[PDB]
Each structure stands twice: as structure tokens, then as C-alpha cells.
Design a protein around this ligand. Structure first.
Ligand SMILES: Nc1ncnc2c1ncn2[C@@H]1O[C@H](COP(=O)(O)OP(=O)(O)OP(=O)(O)O)[C@@H](O)[C@H]1O
Ligand SMILES: [Mg+2]
Lengths: 208, 393, 62
């Protein structure tokens, strides 16, 4: 979720255009709540629930509006079916996610046949975050430093991997979509050095 | 004329360019209504121009803003002025709770019946809104190598009590909220400021020392009021001053007709700094080049507690700054910098960066990819002689 | 009006120590009357109330 589509979609969503089988734009209501779990979009979903209380009848949408309202804020984390891992490669995410969106054409496939898929259609979400130590005892809390996704491909040799160096954590935190955090102090990230949320932390004093 | 630097040189260039222009020609071909004196493009407000603007029309009235004075007993019975219109005894609408309507508050009230509708955020003027940085530059502590004692002393003050308010309780002490930096220019104070602001984790507030002197009396103080107000509001916020010499350096009175207004303002910074109900959770970082001509009232501890200075690197600070300003650049694998710093007995980190960037200018003018190591040799030579027979030196 | 560490009558030049007792100018100091109060604990408690536990922006909401 970003402001571009996050605003452009409700430009066709708040205006439902209910002359159609309006539960298509209401279907899009649901999976427009598909963004990075929690966000300031509760203003949007909440307001569209207020205007959607009477209008956009609850006879067919009362499950839908709060359905999308609650999807972001389910355990407050754990959305990974993006067919992306590490930085950009692939990984299932389609057998389980896709049949929902194919199952969402318009109507009474939300009535009888739909309730089997629509609830537990996609469940291939692999947690969320990477703040973890896993030094064999698993006691470490090594100093991390959350930032923005690494935007760098080739500029020079002394080139900064991320920009949002402000935040600094040590333990279980927030992965987020554009994040490629590294850390510092060289407490020794020798295991993989390519991220992945269960690093082993082979410890060593490499001239700190 | 020219040559093909990389194989299909124009073959990617014009191919990119003509489709870039075709992006425009698509837009003007389809028809785009541009330059309608401050509106939005119709592609996105056509499906927003509907009654889901009347939802902003009728549900939300004009909501004229006003200011609260006081309340009464057993009931709101609020006394309010508008701004210059008139003062009324009005009451809140039923949409509000009679708790967060405390006095001195900017509140939105109906235009028709004059009933309070909304509590508002208080007023804050742009002149100080703009000095709040609202952003953290990327300045890592490692970039300020060569001042290990200083960065440690500052670390003990602006960092350790905040991120670890545990030791000071387990021993029962209070941190020295007042830090002053000084020393020769071009040395690592600004850098320290930006780096501390990097990991500030706090409402860091810049202050430019000359911004306070003004044309009218007391208005600069009125700034200071809003400063310590936004400070006390924003819990755990930092303040930086810079070249505070303009404020209150002396109390020149032999012929008492010189500078007085910024003396009064300096007094306001005195009171609102310490005295009568201290501030709480605030930290003050200053820095000047001539910390010698200042009013001793600021020199009193409690306000200006620590006096950290940045010196001139003897031989090795210049080496490490060669490692700082020479690292973020392209050079051959044949580096060596002790030979360099042994050649510059007296030079600052700023001059170090001047030699590092001046190193690139040779290959830059000599049509080269990178600053070769030997080219960096030539750079230090021209800066050894340049700094040897320098204009001012 | 009198002190407790030496019974020397004073009047208006007496003192009101935290321990509820009046002293003369010689005995006003807590080390001249063995004050039985935990100044250190009221320590660890005032600094804890005035010290704002800063929070690095992390693990906020949902
Ligand atoms: N030890 C150092 N390491 C890296 N860079 C340095 C060092 N010393 C000086 N510099 C460079 O020289 C410049 C001058 O440093 P700085 O701005 O901290 O001095 P200043 O005291 O703020 O200047 P002035 O006294 O003129 O206000 C900086 O921009 C910095 O990049
Ligand atoms: Mg400076």
C-alpha cells in the first residue's frame, strides 16, 4: 500500500457505481484493505463503513466492510504471500491467494459455494519479521537498525545501503515491505549476510 | 565529431527519448485540460465530484474558530471570544464531552447558534514551525572519528540518560542537561550535531542564532515562549543553539545606549531555561567559536554544564579523516595515508575533504573513470604546495 | 521555641527539618541530628517521575 493506488482506488471505490453488481466495487473494497497490515487507512475504511451503513446495504456487504476492516489488523502482522522473498524472488503465494480473487466475480458465490474458499482461501502467509538472534543458546538480542529498502544497484564502492538510518532496534520488530536492514558494530553476521529472519549469529570479534 | 562510448550509444538514447515524448503526445492526443488556475486533473476528481463532496458539505458546517477564556460552576457556561467579532457566553454541542474543553483553547463553534463543536490544536506560528527540522539527516557517528573523548562526553549526556534511564536511578543522580561545544572552526561540531540528531529519537529542534533579533520589542521573546511551549508539549525533545554570541555576549553599559533588546531576550532565555518550576525533560546543545565573550549567567552550571571542545588533529586525526573523506570515493587498491598526514602538519578535516575531492578533479579534468591512487598523490602534492603557499597562509 | 539536639531556646531563628523537629543554626544539618529518612529512595523516586522513558520508534500498533 502506497498513497498512489491507496487514493486512486477509493476514487473508484467511494463512488461504488452500484448500477453494476455493486458487490464488485464492494469486492474491491475488501481486497483494497490488502496493504501492509496496519495503516492510517482506518480513516478510509471507517468512513466508508459509515457511509456504507445505510448505503451499500448490509444485506450483502455487512460482512464485507468489517471483513476488509479487520484483515489488516488481524494479528497486527503476518502478511507474506507476495510471491517475493529475500528481496525479489518467488514462492508459492499463488495457489492459495489467487483462488479467492478468482472466487470473487460478483454475487451468490458469496452465498453457498463461496464460504468454503472466502474464509480460508489464502493461508500461505509466512509470519512477518526478522528481528531474531538464534545464536545456539538463543539468548542474543544483537543491535539491529531498521531502515528503508536498499535502493542501491551500482553507484560507487562507498555506497550507503539504506537511507532511513534513524530507527535502531535489537530484538523482534517490524520487517515491513521495503526494508533491507543490516545493522552495525560487527557483532558478526556471518551466517547468511543476505537476511531471512532466522539468522544464526556465529559470534566473533573481527577487529571491533 | 564523436565516437561510440558504449555500443548502442544513441541506439538506446533516442529510443528512450521518442517514447518519452510519445508519452506526452498520448496525453495531448487524448485531450488533457491543463492550467485551469489551481485545480486537479479531471481524471481523478470526476469520480470524487459526486455527492461524496456533499458528505463534506452538509455533515460539516463552516465551524467558525474561536478562543476559550474560562468556565463556570456545575455547568460549562463557557466564556469565549471569536477573534475580533465579539465575546459570548456559549455552550458545547452534545457531540462533545465536557472534559477536553479546558481554558485557553482554540475551538470550533457553530456560526448559527454559537455552540462549541470541536476542540482544536493550539496555535503555533510558522516562524518557529519552520525551525523544527522534522527530518533526520543521515550522519553516522563513525563519520565523526578523531574526537573519541568528545563524542564519549556527549554520549554520556544526550544519549545515555535518555536511552537508559536506569543507571541514574539505581545510583540516584541527574544528568547534565546543558552542553556547550567550542573550538576552532571546521572541526566536527556540526557533524556531531547532525549525527546526534540522526539517532535523536526525539523532537529535535534547530535554532539559528540570528533568527531571534527582530524589528519590534519583545517579539523575539514571544518566539522563545512558543519554543519552550512546543518543548514542554513534545516530551523528550532536544534543542540546538548555534553561535549564541549574538544574544547576550555582554552587558555593555558604559554608555548604556548600545544593545539592549537581545539582552532582554537573553534574559527571557535565562528564566525560561532555569528558575521557577524547572522544565522537566529537555536537553540543550550549544556551540560557538568564541566562547569567551559571553555573559557569565549562561556560564553558570545547571544551564551550560559541560564544555566540550574540538581540537586540531596532531598527526593521526588527519590520518583518520583521510580515512573518512578518502573512503567515500573511487581510488585504486594502492592506498596509503600516513605518508599524506605526515605531509600536512596543520590541516582540518574540512581541508582533508578538500584534498580528497580535489583529488578527483584531476581525473575529472583528465577524462578518467576514477581518482587513481597516483592521481591522489598528485592531489596531495598540489594541496601540499597549495596549502604551503596558500593565499591567507 | 527550642532545638532538640541541644535544648537551646531560639524562637524565630529555629529550623523545620523533614523529620518534623526544630533545630538551631548549629544543628540544622542532617548530620548533626542523625536524620532517619531515606533521601536516596525519595531520590530513586523523584528522578523516576521526572525522567521520561524514551522509546525508539518500534513495535507501535498492530
Ligand atoms: N575530524 C573530522 N572528521 C571528518 N570531517 C571533519 C573533521 N573535522 C572537520 N571536518 C569537516 O570540516 C567541516 C567543519 O566542521 P564543523 O562544521 O563541525 O566545524 P564548525 O565549528 O561547525 O564550523 P564553524 O566553527 O565555522 O561554525 C565539516 O563540514 C566536516 O565535514
Ligand atoms: Mg558550525
Amino acid at each position: 500500500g502506497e498513497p498512489t493506488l491507496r487514493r486512486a482506488v477509493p476514487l473508484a471505490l467511494a463512488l461504488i457505481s452500484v448500477s453494476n453488481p455493486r458487490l464488485n466495487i464492494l469486492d474491491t473494497l475488501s481486497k483494497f484493505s490488502h496493504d501492509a497490515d496496519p495503516e492510517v487507512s482506518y480513516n478510509s475504511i471507517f468512513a466508508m463503513g459509515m457511509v456504507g451503513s445505510g448505503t451499500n446495504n448490509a444485506r450483502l456487504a455487512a460482512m464485507l466492510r468489517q471483513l476488509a476492516q479487520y484483515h489488516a489488523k488481524d494479528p497486527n502482522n503476518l502478511f507474506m504471500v507476495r510471491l517475493a522473498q529475500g528481496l525479489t524472488h518467488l514462492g508459492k503465494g499463488t495457489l492459495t491467494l489467487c483462488p479467492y480473487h478468482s472466487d470473487r466475480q460478483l454475487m451468490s458465490q458469496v452465498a453457498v459455494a463461496g464460504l468454503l474458499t472466502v474464509l480460508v482461501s489464502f493461508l500461505d502467509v509466512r509470519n512477518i519479521i526478522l528481528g531474531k538472534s538464534h545464536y545456539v543458546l538463543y539468548g542474543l538480542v544483537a543491535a539491529m537498525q531498521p531502515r528503508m529498502l536498499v535502493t542501491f544497484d551500482e553507484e560507487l564502492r562507498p555506497l550507503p545501503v539504506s537511507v532511513r538510518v534513524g530507527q535502531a532496534v535489537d530484538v523482534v520488530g517490524q520487517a515491513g515491505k521495503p526494508k533491507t536492514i543490516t545493522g552495525f558494530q560487527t557483532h558478526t553476521t556471518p551466517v547468511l549476510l543476505a537476511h531471512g529472519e532466522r539468522a544464526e549469529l556465529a559470534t566473533e570479534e573481527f577487529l571491533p | 565529431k564523436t565516437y561510440g562510448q558504449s555500443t548502442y550509444s544513441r541506439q538506446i538514447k533516442q529510443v528512450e527519448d521518442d517514447i518519452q515524448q510519445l508519452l506526452k503526445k498520448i496525453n495531448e492526443l487524448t485531450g488533457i485540460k491543463e492550467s485551469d488556475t489551481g485545480l486537479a486533473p479531471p481524471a481523478l476528481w470526476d469520480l470524487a465530484a459526486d455527492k461524496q463532496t456533499l458528505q463534506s458539505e452538509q455533515p460539516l458546517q463552516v465551524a467558525r474558530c474561536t478562543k476559550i477564556i474560562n468556565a463556570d460552576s456545575e455547568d460549562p457556561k463557557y466564556i469565549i471570544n471569536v477573534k475580533q467579532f465579539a465575546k459570548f457566553v456559549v455552550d458545547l454541542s452534545d457531540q462533545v464531552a465536557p472534559t477536553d474543553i479546558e481554558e485557553g483553547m482554540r475551538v470550533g463553534v457553530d456560526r448559527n447558534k454559537y455552540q462549541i463543536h470541536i476542540p482544536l490544536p493550539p496555535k503555533i506560528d510558522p516562524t518557529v514551525t519552520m525551525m523544527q527540522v522534522e527530518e533526520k539527516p543521515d550522519v553516522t557517528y563513525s563519520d565523526v572519528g578523531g574526537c573519541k573523548e568528545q563524542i564519549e562526553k556527549l554520549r554520556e549526556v544526550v544519549e545515555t540518560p535518555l536511552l537508559h534511564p536506569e543507571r541514574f536511578v539505581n545510583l540516584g543522580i541527574e544528568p547534565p542537561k546543558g552542553v556547550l561545544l567550542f573550538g576552532p572552526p571546521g572541526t566536527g561540531k556540526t557533524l556531531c550535531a547532525r549525527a546526534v540528531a540522526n539517532r535523536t529519537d526525539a523532537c529535535f529542534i534547530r535554532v539559528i542564532g540570528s533568527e531571534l533579533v527582530q524589528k519590534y520589542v519583545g517579539e523575539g521573546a514571544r518566539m522563545v515562549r512558543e519554543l519552550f511551549e512546543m518543548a514542554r508539549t513534545k516530551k523528550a525533545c532536544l534543542i540546538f543553539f548555534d553561535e549564541i554570541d549574538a544574544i547576550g555576549g555582554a552587558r555593555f553599559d558604559d554608555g548604556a545606549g548600545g544593545d539592549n533588546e537581545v539582552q532582554r531576550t537573553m534574559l527571557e532565555l535565562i528564566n525560561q531555561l532555569d528558575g521557577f518550576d524547572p522544565r522537566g525533560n529537555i536537553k540543550v546543545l550549544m556551540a560557538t567559536n568564541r566562547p569567551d565573550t559571553l555573559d557569565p549567567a549562561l556560564m553558570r552550571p545547571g544551564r551550560l554544564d559541560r564544555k566540550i571542545e574540538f581540537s586540531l588533529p596532531d598527526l593521526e586525526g588527519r590520518t583518520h579523516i583521510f580515512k573518512i573523506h578518502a573512503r567515500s570515493m573511487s581510488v585504486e587498491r594502492d592506498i596509503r595515508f600516513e605518508l599524506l598526514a605526515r605531509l600536512c602538519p596543520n590541516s582540518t578535516g574540512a581541508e582533508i575533504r578538500s584534498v580528497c575531492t580535489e583529488a578527483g578533479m584531476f581525473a575529472i579534468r583528465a577524462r578518467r573513470k576514477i581518482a587513481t591512487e597516483k592521481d591522489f598523490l598528485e592531489a596531495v602534492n598540489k594541496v601540499i604546495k597549495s596549502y604551503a603557499k596558500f593565499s591567507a597562509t | 521555641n527550642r532545638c532538640f539536639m541541644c535544648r537551646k531556646k531560639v524562637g524565630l531563628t529555629g529550623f523545620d527539618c523533614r523529620c518534623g523537629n526544630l533545630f538551631c543554626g548549629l544543628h540544622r544539618y542532617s548530620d548533626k541530628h542523625n536524620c532517619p529518612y531515606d533521601y536516596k529512595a525519595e531520590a530513586a523516586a523523584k528522578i523516576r517521575k521526572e525522567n521520561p522513558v524514551v522509546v525508539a520508534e518500534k513495535i507501535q500498533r498492530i
